[PDB]
Design an enzyme around this catalytic site. Structure first.
Site, PDB file in Angstrom:
ATOM      1  N   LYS A  61      -9.333   1.002  -1.074  1.00  0.00           N
ATOM      2  CA  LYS A  61      -8.662   1.246   0.205  1.00  0.00           C
ATOM      3  C   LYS A  61      -9.197   2.473   0.943  1.00  0.00           C
ATOM      4  CE  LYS A  61      -4.354  -0.912  -1.314  1.00  0.00           C
ATOM      5  NZ  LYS A  61      -2.921  -0.693  -1.655  1.00  0.00           N
ATOM      6  N   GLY A  96      -1.787  -2.011   5.440  1.00  0.00           N
ATOM      7  CA  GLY A  96      -1.280  -3.124   6.239  1.00  0.00           C
ATOM      8  C   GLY A  96      -1.938  -4.444   5.900  1.00  0.00           C
ATOM      9  N   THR A 111       0.786  -1.270   0.000  1.00  0.00           N
ATOM     10  CA  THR A 111       0.000   0.000   0.000  1.00  0.00           C
ATOM     11  C   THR A 111       0.799   1.292   0.000  1.00  0.00           C
ATOM     12  OG1 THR A 111      -1.778  -1.177   1.071  1.00  0.00           O
ATOM     13  CG2 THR A 111      -1.981   1.194   1.210  1.00  0.00           C
ATOM     14  N   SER A 120       3.082  -1.302  -4.356  1.00  0.00           N
ATOM     15  CA  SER A 120       2.102  -0.295  -4.756  1.00  0.00           C
ATOM     16  C   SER A 120       1.945  -0.249  -6.274  1.00  0.00           C
ATOM     17  CB  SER A 120       2.504   1.084  -4.228  1.00  0.00           C
ATOM     18  OG  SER A 120       2.605   1.082  -2.814  1.00  0.00           O
ATOM     19  N   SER A 170       3.735   1.130   2.764  1.00  0.00           N
ATOM     20  CA  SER A 170       5.097   0.864   2.293  1.00  0.00           C
ATOM     21  C   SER A 170       5.623   1.943   1.349  1.00  0.00           C
ATOM     22  CB  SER A 170       5.178  -0.511   1.628  1.00  0.00           C
ATOM     23  OG  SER A 170       4.211  -0.637   0.601  1.00  0.00           O
ATOM     24  N   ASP A 210       7.394   2.234  -5.291  1.00  0.00           N
ATOM     25  CA  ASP A 210       7.174   1.108  -4.389  1.00  0.00           C
ATOM     26  C   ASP A 210       6.671  -0.130  -5.129  1.00  0.00           C
ATOM     27  OD1 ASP A 210       7.062  -0.133  -1.756  1.00  0.00           O
ATOM     28  OD2 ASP A 210       4.885   0.133  -1.840  1.00  0.00           O
ATOM     29  N   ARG A 250      -3.596  -1.692  -5.283  1.00  0.00           N
ATOM     30  CA  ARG A 250      -2.891  -2.978  -5.317  1.00  0.00           C
ATOM     31  C   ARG A 250      -2.979  -3.753  -4.000  1.00  0.00           C
ATOM     32  NH1 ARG A 250       3.270  -3.818  -7.619  1.00  0.00           N
ATOM     33  NH2 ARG A 250       2.089  -3.327  -9.523  1.00  0.00           N
ATOM     34  N   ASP A 282      -3.667   3.853  -3.456  1.00  0.00           N
ATOM     35  CA  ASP A 282      -3.486   3.011  -4.637  1.00  0.00           C
ATOM     36  C   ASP A 282      -4.523   1.874  -4.625  1.00  0.00           C
ATOM     37  OD1 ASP A 282      -1.456   0.340  -3.876  1.00  0.00           O
ATOM     38  OD2 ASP A 282      -1.706   1.964  -2.427  1.00  0.00           O
TER      39      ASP A 282
HETATM   40  C1  LIG Z   1       0.098  -2.582   0.277  1.00  0.00           C
HETATM   41  C2  LIG Z   1      -0.434  -3.189  -1.051  1.00  0.00           C
HETATM   42  C3  LIG Z   1       1.209  -3.555   0.766  1.00  0.00           C
HETATM   43  O1  LIG Z   1       2.499  -3.034   0.374  1.00  0.00           O
HETATM   44  C4  LIG Z   1      -1.064  -2.410   1.329  1.00  0.00           C
HETATM   45  O2  LIG Z   1      -0.498  -2.368   2.653  1.00  0.00           O
HETATM   46  C5  LIG Z   1      -2.193  -3.489   1.381  1.00  0.00           C
HETATM   47  C6  LIG Z   1      -3.348  -2.990   2.298  1.00  0.00           C
HETATM   48  C7  LIG Z   1      -4.765  -3.198   1.758  1.00  0.00           C
HETATM   49  C8  LIG Z   1      -5.006  -4.142   0.737  1.00  0.00           C
HETATM   50  C9  LIG Z   1      -6.330  -4.450   0.350  1.00  0.00           C
HETATM   51  C10 LIG Z   1      -7.402  -3.804   0.968  1.00  0.00           C
HETATM   52  C11 LIG Z   1      -7.162  -2.817   1.950  1.00  0.00           C
HETATM   53  C12 LIG Z   1      -5.842  -2.491   2.311  1.00  0.00           C
HETATM   54  N1  LIG Z   1      -1.678  -4.706   2.001  1.00  0.00           N
HETATM   55  C13 LIG Z   1      -1.736  -5.908   1.390  1.00  0.00           C
HETATM   56  O3  LIG Z   1      -1.762  -6.033   0.167  1.00  0.00           O
HETATM   57  C14 LIG Z   1      -1.695  -7.118   2.301  1.00  0.00           C
HETATM   58  C15 LIG Z   1      -0.225  -7.613   2.352  1.00  0.00           C
HETATM   59  C16 LIG Z   1       0.301  -8.120   3.699  1.00  0.00           C
HETATM   60  C17 LIG Z   1       0.654  -9.484   3.879  1.00  0.00           C
HETATM   61  C18 LIG Z   1       1.180  -9.912   5.099  1.00  0.00           C
HETATM   62  C19 LIG Z   1       1.404  -8.982   6.144  1.00  0.00           C
HETATM   63  O4  LIG Z   1       2.073  -9.397   7.305  1.00  0.00           O
HETATM   64  C20 LIG Z   1       1.288  -9.842   8.431  1.00  0.00           C
HETATM   65  C21 LIG Z   1       0.995  -7.659   5.995  1.00  0.00           C
HETATM   66  C22 LIG Z   1       0.462  -7.220   4.758  1.00  0.00           C
HETATM   67  N2  LIG Z   1      -2.524  -8.178   1.731  1.00  0.00           N
HETATM   68  C23 LIG Z   1      -2.953  -9.270   2.416  1.00  0.00           C
HETATM   69  O5  LIG Z   1      -3.106  -9.317   3.634  1.00  0.00           O
HETATM   70  C24 LIG Z   1      -3.244 -10.497   1.586  1.00  0.00           C
HETATM   71  C25 LIG Z   1      -4.606 -10.337   0.856  1.00  0.00           C
HETATM   72  N3  LIG Z   1      -3.237 -11.695   2.437  1.00  0.00           N
HETATM   73  C26 LIG Z   1      -2.076 -12.284   2.831  1.00  0.00           C
HETATM   74  O6  LIG Z   1      -0.957 -11.939   2.442  1.00  0.00           O
HETATM   75  C27 LIG Z   1      -2.174 -13.377   3.868  1.00  0.00           C
HETATM   76  N4  LIG Z   1      -1.716 -12.892   5.193  1.00  0.00           N
HETATM   77  C28 LIG Z   1      -2.825 -12.727   6.171  1.00  0.00           C
HETATM   78  C29 LIG Z   1      -2.272 -12.145   7.501  1.00  0.00           C
HETATM   79  O7  LIG Z   1      -1.208 -12.983   7.999  1.00  0.00           O
HETATM   80  C30 LIG Z   1      -0.092 -13.068   7.084  1.00  0.00           C
HETATM   81  C31 LIG Z   1      -0.557 -13.665   5.727  1.00  0.00           C
END
Ligand SMILES: *[C@@](C)(CO)[C@](*)(O)[C@H](Cc1ccccc1)NC(=O)[C@H](Cc1ccc(OC)cc1)NC(=O)[C@H](C)NC(=O)CN1CCOCC1
Ligand SMILES: *[C@@](C)(CO)[C@](*)(O)[C@H](Cc1ccccc1)NC(=O)[C@H](Cc1ccc(OC)cc1)NC(=O)[C@H](C)NC(=O)CN1CCOCC1
Ligand SMILES: [Cl-]
Ligand SMILES: [Cl-]
Ligand SMILES: [Cl-]
Ligand SMILES: [Cl-]
Ligand SMILES: [Cl-]
Ligand SMILES: [Cl-]
Ligand SMILES: [Cl-]
Ligand SMILES: [Cl-]
Ligand SMILES: [K+]
Ligand SMILES: [K+]
Lengths: 244, 204, 219, 238, 243, 230, 199, 248
Positions: free
Chosen positions: C33, C47, C1, C169, C129, C166, C19, C17
């Site tokens: 988002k 997050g 994000t 992103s 990020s 990023d 993604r 964004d």
């Molecule tokens: C950007 C894209 C990441 O750089 C944003 O933070 C984004 C936030 C967002 C996305 C969709 C809707 C609303 C807000 N975050 C993600 O894309 C996020 C990535 C993530 C994975 C693991 C993390 O560590 C605990 C933190 C962030 N996406 C997810 O959670 C995806 C859909 N699911 C997984 O990766 C599975 N996770 C669940 C939690 O436990 C670890 C594995």
């Protein structure tokens, strides 16, 4: 003045004329008890209690009706003494909780306010009965000055210059009104407190009595304690001789 | 990895007034395969299907517990479930186990009862919903399945062509994953009918 | 994000964004988002995806219930305190970095709240990020009392910077303008990347896939 | 009466009948006498038999090395109060390593006995106790009742015909403070004797004695151990 | 068939054959058992509280005898009924107000505090184990948005906003007084509202009281701080009535 | 310290009648009248808000309340009891939204709210609610009107009245109400049913009215009520 | 953080830097770490941002109720005690030092340190990560009986010197002066910071 | 406190439970509700008590509840208590399914709710549920089944039974007409309309006043339908046409 059968058994039941008789009957228990007194002076607060000798087999100093709730706070009780002691324990814990939380001696008004909340809580439910006693709280400091409060079974608390509870609360109050307590020293007030108890006492209905006396003022450095055997006996002699 | 233990591949695709869902038929423990006819896609209604990839227990457990909640929904409500609502029901079910989650990433594919509209989605193991207009993939060969779908998918596919595309995408992505395969099963969902097929997949 | 917030003369503006990543693979190219809280209070989540989703929906659920009970325009400071006390209770295990912005009787307001439950009120902020890219643009070009259009362009640039710099992103920059009059949720305001066009057809004539079993259920 | 089935119901006169009904249970039990000198505290109690074939009831119980009790009323309520007193004395020794002052132990009874009088569905304790102890302040004689009230006494008697014993002690209360232990027990026995009908007097089978003081820990003499005290008896007069 | 009873409907908060709650109705009569009357009036720029201060003897500390209470910097109340019952309600109101600010971050509105006290009062009306509170809370204060406010809550659980209101023994006569003063449209200033309140209580009781005999609490747009007037300031408005 | 009663305050009489429910029904049958009308393209709910004194601030409290964006409430009976049910209804509406991400079908809210009402006819130490609810809603492009009552029973209505003169208001509606009204017509026949039971002169302050359509649920402003009052 | 409080005759002075940090990044370069607990009692925040702020809220909550129950402005001693108690009850779970300073009618201007759950009154007190670099300065530059303006300079100088040395401190200097008359909040900006040896 | 206790779960001198028998009276004043078992199916038929020109008709049924894939019930008594029990019936059914992965046998589901209703007569000091229930269904053990539930928590398997208003008259009417082992669904549907017509209050019978649901086994699937208005119309009129052929 009373209501039979239905409306006077529980404290969770109002009477048709908007009264809680369970509280009023508990208020009757204190009216039957021997008189407790306490009046605010210029530099402190004095307490006086008549203690009716049930039997000469009891120790001189038994059934103490004057309590130390906190170092600077004294309690004078009238009513069911068993309840009076539990409230003395509740009041003690409250003054203890306040220091634990805030770091200094509980302000008397607040101590009275807090204990009153606990008393009142026993007037709302069928699960418990109201407290069958009334009690006074007295303190002194240089900051807050002399303070005197009294709580009854309903949970009501008020400040006082002069106050009395028990058998002859009326006979006492009219005798208290006579005093210029706002100008009197607490050494003087003891003498007068002692004589009012003697006047109030019924020596032809009740058999005999002992006089309990308490301090809380500048002469005690702000600490609540008992009036010495010397000072009491001078005030007892004063009481017997101005009774004529 | 925890998801790696059992393997599995689930994929969903969209077409012209239709949806397709596909899964591998393997049940295996790390080193060996136990069953050739293991079920991963479960019908949550006439014209609405859920495919589950991940730990075999949680695949089965989620399917049984979703059915529990779905049947109560369909009894209390006077209706059959809309696709968006199932997605949210799976989302709540999974997220309830936030800090001790079921190790499965579900795929929902169906046509909206009444309205006809095609709907596909995939979810987290903790219940994050993903809705797309094309395809969703889940399993140990996500990367392989993504590579196929991106290259193979077209906007308006008829049932005949959609089946071929989702098949070829599944067949070839599974052949690069050591923990997926032993046959592929394809469900094609139309308004008039449902077509179920097992493919002549590699048995190695 | 990458998510960002900005205060201007007539209100606030939020950016995001589109993604979502599962591992290091782009799961969703067009996820939303910027989340609805009140009609004039919005929240950007960064997050853990499911975490930012539930916290924000829970907050909105509590905010509508609060507006119903008071019959008043929801306060953004109420949103911020509800959010942080919820997140503090979970000791940072709910991975939700939030940028909350809106309009009150007390004017335009912008807050940021971290997963552990800390908050700060400020004219501009950035989370996620790609936050480094966005604050860089903001610290560079932010002025007090900007025009909506001057404020809308800077925010786009801030999110764009995050998208391009990023790896976590991408997609489109979503914007939400909140004025003392109303709120416009400009989804896909700007869209930097385009590749939908191609020249490779990979079709299969019905019957190329070898089939062993066929079953048809009439409806 | 309808103001007399629950402890949480006040009488219009300003009284609780269920407390007073529990106070009746004390009066029905056999008499017990407590008295003290400047050095000793003595308990003397009358054991009772339902029939001649059954043995006599226990009246005096152990609490701690420095505290002893004599009971009057319900057996189970007495045993329950005894176990609370023992537990309090144990906790005091466990924590502070010093014996619990008598005054404070009685205060705990006063606080505990008060609780059930104020809660619905609960009842008062159907027992009254005479507590003899020794601490830093010397010997003590205390009195507890079904009502949570308690008294510090020079001497006391509770139970059936305890009024007679009460009057005896009231005449001789100034005598006790300079009393020798042997003279102190005889005073206690002489008061207990007054409670009995003219036909009968104190026997080795129906008299129990408890003694605590500066010299020794609390001791119960029952049968053969009791006759030294009974022998040397001024005769029952009228 | 008005006023019929069957079962324990006169003793506990259950329904009568008519569908009434006698225990709630008795709780209103308990308000009059205080033997006092409270009046509140609202102006364009203010809200005013007024109540009789009866002091039986000079033995009482007069400064400690009051039915005027502070819940918040902005919100005050006057209590009518059983004194101990009233104090419990005040303490709970302060709790609710401070609790509100901890959860939501802004000062509780006068209307919201009232509703919260009313909802708690409702519970005593539905659960059989406890009696209602034989007291009456009239709240005042200024809403930053909707101007001055005057609110009243019940032992029944009823709550409402008012232009003017009375409570207690002489309630019914003082509400009728207030209606006549409302019909005619005055300039509702600070002086006008204070005197309307004071003159209302001085007529229904017929006293023409000393400054020591009453209590006055005010709330004003310029100064939203809840203030009890003391002897010297009431004395000014009392000699201002005799002009 | 306290601990509640654990026995039912609503029991079966020899006649097979739960008297406390019928006694609760008497509380609503004696309350201020309220009417609801389902009108093909919307719903209307109106009530008598006659505070019976000029001293009251008519704007301070409301009887027609929103539960969510698409659901509204009116009552006949006890105001305090109704408040409890409103708060419970709003929470149930949110509980449903959080789980399903879809506006609660009116039928489903009513069932959930009616079940709360049922509890107080069987649970210990409590009396039933002395309120009957009139719940309107819009979902799936269809107007809904429901009645909940102290029993825990719920009914669906094309049109109905409750409170004072509920019997006369009902027969009036039988003759007056016809299916396929426009919403603005329904506000008239709603205020007309209210006039049958009034007693006094109607001002926009004396009565309260809310409406529900495809655009959601809202309470009519005092200025809007005046325009219909002619 | 760098936080500081100084006692004078009429009241107290409370200062802080304006930085919040996560690792090597600063996330807020303009944060006010001077939270009011009551009208004439402030507290200076350090340590975990979430932990600190949570303590500040509960302290302000209890002091509001306590203030109303006594119908008097809370004692500075009382304020310090409540913060000290929350800090002690969760010394393993909450990680923040809070300086509590203010003014009351009973005891005038007062300064209290509550680090870890202990309680001590001091003529002046420093706290935070940057406090290490100014222990020597405050010991040398302190005089008893400083005027309000002198105390104001003393805190400004000490915090300026800490911020320049400490990587976890930066931004502006927030100053509040609490007396009987009220609270004076002022901000010392980058151009206005006192200059010393910088090489 | 005990002054206010109605003592609901207590014994009467005769050895019977008052509240249970008082609850029975409530059932009598509720709608007539009958169930008939046939060779190729089983049905419920019940009197609608919610009738008015102004009622909206939103739900499929008033008194018929689908509990299971292979089970349905009908109700008589207090409808709120009925809703509570039917929702619970749907839950027990799903818990069994979740555990064993096959539908709950008919008798077992009935037994489970009866255990809850019986518990309400023994402990807890609560009023019992004033509801009688008629269960119809198919399991793989006993095929088509019909059951009756009392507020006592007592149950029995029936071939034909009735609960509610004029209940005793309706069953003795069935006792003569019911042809054991020879009953088809067409025969049972006709009998239902016959028994209802004599038993009901308003006399002529109507498609708005009655509710009929059929449970059949079709193509290896248990099919449950609540009969449409056009269907009930033909069922009433076929009995009406036979009522005109009964004289000469
Ligand atoms: C950007 C894209 C990441 O750089 C944003 O933070 C984004 C936030 C967002 C996305 C969709 C809707 C609303 C807000 N975050 C993600 O894309 C996020 C990535 C993530 C994975 C693991 C993390 O560590 C605990 C933190 C962030 N996406 C997810 O959670 C995806 C859909 N699911 C997984 O990766 C599975 N996770 C669940 C939690 O436990 C670890 C594995
Ligand atoms: C100076 C600037 C350096 O920390 C101050 O101590 C400052 C004080 C403060 C108080 C209230 C509000 C804002 C600022 N403290 C911080 O800036 C603080 C530093 C810190 C982090 C972690 C700690 O371990 C528990 C202790 C102190 N920064 C934060 O808390 C920021 C907002 N967030 C994080 O760093 C997240 N942490 C949580 C704990 O684990 C590591 C990641
Ligand atoms: Cl489940
Ligand atoms: Cl939240
Ligand atoms: Cl016994
Ligand atoms: Cl005795
Ligand atoms: Cl009980
Ligand atoms: Cl409940
Ligand atoms: Cl509205
Ligand atoms: Cl220092
Ligand atoms: K109301
Ligand atoms: K069979």
């Amino acid at each position: 003045s009373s209501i039979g059968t239905g409306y006077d058994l529980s404290a969770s039941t109002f009477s048709p004329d908007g009264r809680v008789f369970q509280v009023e009957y508990a208020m009757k228990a204190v009216e039957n008890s021997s008189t407790a007194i306490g009046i605010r002076c210029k530099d402190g607060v004095v307490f006086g209690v008549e203690k009716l000798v049930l039997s000469k087999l009891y120790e001189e100093g038994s059934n103490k009706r004057l309590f130390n709730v906190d170092r600077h706070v004294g309690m004078a009780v009238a009513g069911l003494l068993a309840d009076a002691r539990s409230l003395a324990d509740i009041a003690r814990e409250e003054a203890s909780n306040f220091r634990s939380n805030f770091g200094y001696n509980i302000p008397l008004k607040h101590l009275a306010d807090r204990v009153a909340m606990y008393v009142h809580a026993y007037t709302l439910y069928s699960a418990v009965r109201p407290f069958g006693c009334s009690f006074m709280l007295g303190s002194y400091s240089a900051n807050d000055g002399a303070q005197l409060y009294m709580i009854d079974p309903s949970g009501v608390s008020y400040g006082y210059w002069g106050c009395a509870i028990g058998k002859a609360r009326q006979a006492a109050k009219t005798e208290i009104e006579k005093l210029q307590m706002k100008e009197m020293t607490c050494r003087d007030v003891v003498k007068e407190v002692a004589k009012i108890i003697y006047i109030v006492h019924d020596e032809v209905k009740d058999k005999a009595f002992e006089l309990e006396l308490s301090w809380v003022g500048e002469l005690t450095k702000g600490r609540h304690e008992i009036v010495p055997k010397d000072i009491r006996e001078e005030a007892e002699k004063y009481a017997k001789e101005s009774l004529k | 990895s925890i998801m790696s233990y059992n393997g599995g591949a689930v994929m969903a695709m969209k077409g012209k007034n239709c949806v397709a869902i596909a899964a591998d038929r393997r049940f295996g423990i790390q080193a060996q395969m136990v069953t050739t006819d293991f079920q991963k896609i479960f019908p949550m209604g006439d014209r609405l299907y859920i495919g589950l990839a991940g730990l075999a227990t949680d695949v089965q457990t989620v399917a049984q517990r979703l059915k529990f909640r779905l049947n109560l929904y369909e009894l209390k409500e006077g209706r059959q479930i809309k696709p968006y609502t199932l997605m949210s029901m799976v989302a709540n079910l999974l997220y309830e186990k936030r800090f001790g989650p079921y190790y499965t990433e579900p795929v929902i594919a169906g046509l909206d009862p009444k309205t006809f509209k095609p709907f596909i989605c995939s979810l987290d193991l903790i219940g994050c919903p993903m809705v797309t207009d094309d395809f969703v993939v889940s399993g140990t060969c996500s990367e392989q399945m993504y590579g196929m779908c991106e290259s193979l998918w077209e906007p308006n596919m008829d049932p005949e062509h959609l089946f071929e595309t989702i098949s070829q995408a599944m067949l070839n992505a599974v052949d690069r994953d050591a923990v997926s395969g032993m046959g592929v099963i394809v469900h094609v969902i139309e308004k008039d009918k449902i077509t179920t097929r097992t493919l002549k997949a590699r048995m190695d | 994000t990458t998510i960002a917030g900005l205060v201007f003369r007539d209100g606030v503006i939020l950016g995001a964004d589109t993604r979502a990543t599962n591992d290091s693979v782009v799961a969703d190219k067009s996820c939303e988002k910027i989340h609805f809280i009140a009609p004039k209070i919005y929240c950007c989540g960064a997050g853990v995806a499911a975490d930012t989703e539930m916290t924000t929906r829970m907050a909105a659920s509590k905010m509508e219930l609060h507006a119903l009970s008071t019959g008043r325009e929801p306060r953004v400071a109420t949103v911020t305190r509800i959010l942080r006390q919820t997140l503090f209770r979970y000791q940072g295990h709910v991975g939700a970095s939030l940028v909350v912005g809106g309009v009150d009787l007390n004017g335009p307001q912008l807050y940021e709240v971290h997963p552990h439950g800390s908050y700060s009120r400020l004219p501009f902020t950035a989370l996620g990020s790609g936050q480094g890219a966005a604050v860089a643009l903001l610290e560079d070009r932010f002025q007090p009392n900007m025009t909506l259009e001057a404020a809308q362009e800077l925010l786009v640039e801030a999110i764009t910077a995050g998208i391009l710099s990023d790896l976590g992103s991408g997609g489109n920059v979503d914007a939400c303008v909140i004025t003392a009059g109303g709120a416009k949720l400009q989804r896909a305001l700007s869209t930097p990347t385009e590749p939908v066009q191609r020249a490779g057809r990979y079709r299969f004539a019905p019957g190329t896939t070898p089939v062993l079993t066929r079953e048809v259920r009439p409806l | 009466n309808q103001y007399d089935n629950d402890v949480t119901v006040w009488s219009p006169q300003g009284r609780i009948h269920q407390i007073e009904y529990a106070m009746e249970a004390v009066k029905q039990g056999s008499a017990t006498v407590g008295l003290k000198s400047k050095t000793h505290a003595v308990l003397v109690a009358l054991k009772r038999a339902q029939s001649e074939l059954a043995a006599h009831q226990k009246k005096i119980l152990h609490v701690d090395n420095h505290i002893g009790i004599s009971i009057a009323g319900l057996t189970a309520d007495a045993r329950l109060l005894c176990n609370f007193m023992r537990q309090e004395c144990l906790d005091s020794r466990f924590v502070f390593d010093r014996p619990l002052p008598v005054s404070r132990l009685v205060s705990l009874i006063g606080s505990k006995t008060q609780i059930p009088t104020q809660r619905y569905g609960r009842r008062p304790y159907g027992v009254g106790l005479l507590i003899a102890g020794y601490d830093d302040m010397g010997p003590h004689i205390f009195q507890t009742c079904p009502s949570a009230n308690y008294f510090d006494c020079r001497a006391m008697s509770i139970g059936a015909r305890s009024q007679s014993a009460r009057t005896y002690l009231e005449r001789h209360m100034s005598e006790f403070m300079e009393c020798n232990l042997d003279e102190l027990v005889k005073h206690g026995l002489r008061a207990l004797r007054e409670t009995l009908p003219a036909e009968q007097d104190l026997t080795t089978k129906n008299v129990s004695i408890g003694i605590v003081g500066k010299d020794l820990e609390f001791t119960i003499y029952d049968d053969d151990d009791v006759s030294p005290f009974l022998d040397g008896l001024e005769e029952r007069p009228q | 068939s008005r006023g019929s009873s069957a079962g324990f409907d006169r003793h506990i908060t259950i329904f009568s054959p008519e569908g009434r709650l006698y225990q709630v109705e008795y709780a209103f009569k308990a308000i009059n058992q205080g033997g006092l009357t409270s009046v509140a009036v609202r102006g364009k720029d203010c809200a005013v509280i007024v109540t009789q201060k009866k002091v039986p003897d000079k033995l009482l500390d007069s400064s400690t005898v009051t039915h005027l209470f502070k819940i918040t910097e902005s919100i005050g109340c006057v209590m009518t009924g059983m004194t101990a019952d009233s104090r419990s309600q005040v303490q709970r109101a302060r709790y609710e107000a401070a609790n509100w600010k901890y959860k939501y971050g802004y000062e509780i509105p006068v209307d919201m505090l009232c509703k919260r006290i009313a909802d708690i009062s409702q519970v005593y009306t539905q659960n059989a184990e406890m009696r209602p509170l034989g007291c009456c809370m009239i709240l005042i204060g200024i809403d930053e948005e909707q101007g001055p406010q005057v609110y009243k809550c019940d032992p029944a659980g009823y709550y409402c906003g008012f232009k003017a209101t009375a409570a207690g023994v002489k309630q019914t006569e003082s509400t009728s007084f207030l209606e006549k003063k409302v019909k005619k449209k005055f300039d509702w200033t600070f002086e006008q509202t204070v005197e309307t309140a004071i003159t209302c209580l001085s007529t229904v009781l017929s006293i023409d009281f000393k400054p020591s005999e009453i209590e006055v609490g005010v709330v004003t747009v310029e100064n939203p701080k809840f203030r009890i007037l003391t002897e010297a300031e009431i004395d000014a408005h009392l000699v201002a009535l005799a002009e | 310290a306290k601990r509640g009663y654990s026995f039912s305050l609503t029991t079966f009489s020899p006649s097979g009648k739960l008297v406390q429910i019928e006694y609760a029904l008497a509380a609503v049958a004696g309350g201020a009248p309220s009417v609801g009308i389902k009108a093909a393209n919307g719903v209307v709910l109106a009530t008598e808000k006659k505070q019976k004194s000029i001293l009251y601030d008519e704007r301070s409290v409301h009887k027609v309340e929103p539960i969510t964006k698409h659901i509204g409430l009116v009552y006949s009976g006890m105001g305090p009891d109704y408040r409890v049910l409103v708060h419970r209804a709003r929470k149930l509406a949110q509980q449903y939204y959080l789980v399903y991400q879809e506006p609660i079908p009116t039928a489903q809210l009513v069932q959930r709210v009616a079940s709360v009402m049922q509890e107080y006819t069987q649970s210990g130490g409590v009396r039933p609610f002395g309120v009957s609810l009139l719940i309107c809603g819009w979902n799936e492009g269809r107007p809904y009107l429901f009645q909940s009552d102290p029993s825990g029973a719920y009914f669906a209505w094309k049109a109905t009245a409750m409170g004072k003169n509920y019997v006369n208001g009902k027969t009036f509606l039988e003759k007056r109400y016809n299916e396929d009204l426009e919403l603005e017509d329904a506000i008239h026949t709603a205020i007309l049913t209210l006039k049958e039971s009034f007693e006094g002169q109607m001002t926009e302050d004396n009565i309260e009215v809310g409406i529900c359509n495809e655009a959601g649920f809202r309470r009519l402003t005092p200025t809007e009520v005046r325009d219909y009052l002619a | 953080t760098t936080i500081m409080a100084v006692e004078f005759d009429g009241g107290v002075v409370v200062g802080s830097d304006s930085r919040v940090s996560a690792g090597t990044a600063v996330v807020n370069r303009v944060f006010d770490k001077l939270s009011p607990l009551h009208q004439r009692i402030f507290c200076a925040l350090s340590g975990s941002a979430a932990d600190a702020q949570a303590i500040a809220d509960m302290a302000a909550y209890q002091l509001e109720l306590h203030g109303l129950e006594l119908e008097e402005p809370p004692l500075v001693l009382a304020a310090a005690n409540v913060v000290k108690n929350i800090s002690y009850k969760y010394r393993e779970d909450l990680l923040a030092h809070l300086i509590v300073a203010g003014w009351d009618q009973r005891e005038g201007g007062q300064v209290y340190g509550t680090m870890g759950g202990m309680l001590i009154r001091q003529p002046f007190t420093i706290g935070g990560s940057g406090s290490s670099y100014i222990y020597g300065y405050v010991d040398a530059a302190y005089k008893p009986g400083m005027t309000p303006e002198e105390c104001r300079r003393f805190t400004t100088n000490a915090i300026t010197l800490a911020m320049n040395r400490d990587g976890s401190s930066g931004g502006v200097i927030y100053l509040v002066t609490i007396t009987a008359a009220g609270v004076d909040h002022r901000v010392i900006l980058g151009d206005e910071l006192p200059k010393f040896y910088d090489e | 406190s005990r002054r206010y206790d109605s003592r609901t779960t207590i014994f009467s001198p005769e050895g019977r439970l008052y509240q249970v028998e008082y609850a029975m009276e409530a059932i009598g004043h509720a709608g007539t509700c009958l169930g008939i078992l046939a060779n190729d199916g089983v049905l419920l038929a019940a009197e609608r008590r919610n009738i008015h020109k102004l009622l909206d008709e939103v739900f499929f049924s008033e008194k018929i509840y689908k509990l299971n894939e292979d089970m349905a019930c009908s109700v008589a008594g207090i409808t709120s208590d009925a809703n509570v029990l039917t929702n619970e019936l749907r839950l027990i059914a799903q818990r069994y399914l979740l555990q064993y992965q096959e539908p709950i046998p008919c008798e077992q589901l009935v037994t489970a709710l009866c255990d809850i209703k019986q518990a309400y007569t023994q402990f807890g000091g609560k009023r019992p549920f004033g509801v009688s229930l008629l269960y119809i269904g198919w399991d793989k053990h006993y095929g088509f089944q019909l059951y009756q539930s009392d507020p006592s928590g007592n149950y029995g398997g029936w071939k034909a039974t009735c609960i509610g208003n004029n209940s005793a008259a309706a069953v003795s009417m069935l006792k003569q007409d019911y042809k054991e082992g020879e009953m088809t669904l067409k025969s049972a549907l006709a009998l239902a309309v016959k028994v209802l017509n004599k038993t009901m209050d308003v006399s002529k019978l109507s498609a708005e006043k009655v509710e009929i649901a059929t449970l059949t086994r079709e193509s290896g699937k248990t099919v449950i339908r609540v009969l449409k208005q056009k269907e009930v119309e033909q069922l009433i009129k076929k009995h009406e046409e036979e009522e005109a052929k009964a004289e000469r």
